[PDB]
From a paper:
In the Y122F structure, very little electron density was observed in the substrate channel, which is in contrast to all other four structures. However, there is still a little electron density remaining in the vicinity of the di-iron site, which we assigned to a water molecule forming a hydrogen-bond interactions with the carboxylic oxygen atoms of Glu144 and Glu115. This water molecule is not coordinated to either iron ions, with a distance of 3.28 Å and 3.15 Å, respectively. Apart from harboring the vacant substrate channel, the Y122F mutant shows comparable enzymatic activity with wild type. This result is consistent with that of the equivalent Y135F mutant in PmADO. In the Y122F structure, the di-iron site is surrounded by the four-helix bundle, each iron ion is penta-coordinated by two bridging carboxylates ligands (Glu60 and Glu144), one bidentate carboxylates and one histidine ligand (Glu32 and His63 for Fe1, Glu115 and His147 for Fe2). The coordination geometry of the two iron atoms is similar to that of other di-iron proteins in their rest state of reduced forms which is consistent with the initial state of cADO in the reaction cycle.
Cyanobacterial aldehyde-deformylating oxygenase (cADO), which catalyzes the conversion of Cn fatty aldehyde to its corresponding Cn-1 alk(a/e)ne, is a key enzyme in that pathway. Cyanobacterial aldehyde-deformylating oxygenase (cADO) belongs to the superfamily of ferritin-like di-iron proteins and contains a di-iron center. To gain insights into the reaction catalyzed by cADO, we determined structures of wild type ADO from Synechococcus elongates PCC7942 (Se) with different treatment (WT0, no treatment; WT1, co-crystallized with iron; WT-HP, soaked in H2O2), and solved the structures of two SeADO mutants (Y122F and F86YF87Y). SeADO belongs to the di-iron protein family, with conserved sequence of two EX28-29EX2H motifs, in which six conservative amino acids from four helices (Glu32 from helix H1, Glu115 from helix H4, Glu60 & His63 from helix H2, and Glu144 & His147 from helix H5) act as metal ligands.
Author numbering: 13 to 227
The structure:
Amino acid sequence: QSESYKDAYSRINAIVIEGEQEAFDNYNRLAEMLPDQRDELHKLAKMEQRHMKGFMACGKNLSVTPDMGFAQKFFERLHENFKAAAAEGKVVTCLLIQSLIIECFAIAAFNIYIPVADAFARKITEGVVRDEYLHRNFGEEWLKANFDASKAELEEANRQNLPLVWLMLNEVADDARELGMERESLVEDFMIAYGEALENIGFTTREIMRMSAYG
Ligand SMILES: [Fe+2]
Ligand SMILES: [Fe+2]
């Protein structure tokens, strides 16, 4: 509740709020492109929205106004990349962007946030991190099941959006530090999460190396 933390919390908290609204909208949109799995998607969606409320509460708790503008342009480049794939019915990219890259970013950041969160906030985030492991898994089940048809596009979707997360990660860097998040942990933990995610899908270790290398 000091001067500097709250400021850092105004944008970071805004980032998780925006990420969550966005994640909500993206699952409802995937729902349409993949109708056979529509309502377990719908549930991933309607789940995302209770996260948004969750993280609004943590800001109100500390008595801080989120900076939605910052957040919304924090996310501009990905969302529009997602949207441009939705509009082409390219569902593979939409899954790579949202379920693998976006959730792995979340999984790594929260696990890093929890040990340093002030007490009300580590309660909800432990509550959320449970739920994103499942979101990552869904994108993981689907992609692994269609790996052969999906791989050429996955490869292309990776080089186009993986550079954007690193910019996102480097932007957070400073405001994460004053929240007690050591940037090397963010950096280290997202790559391992994503790398494991790629391997599980059907990518070999050498391939995976090549893909990470676009940051
Ligand atoms: Fe979420
Ligand atoms: Fe999620």
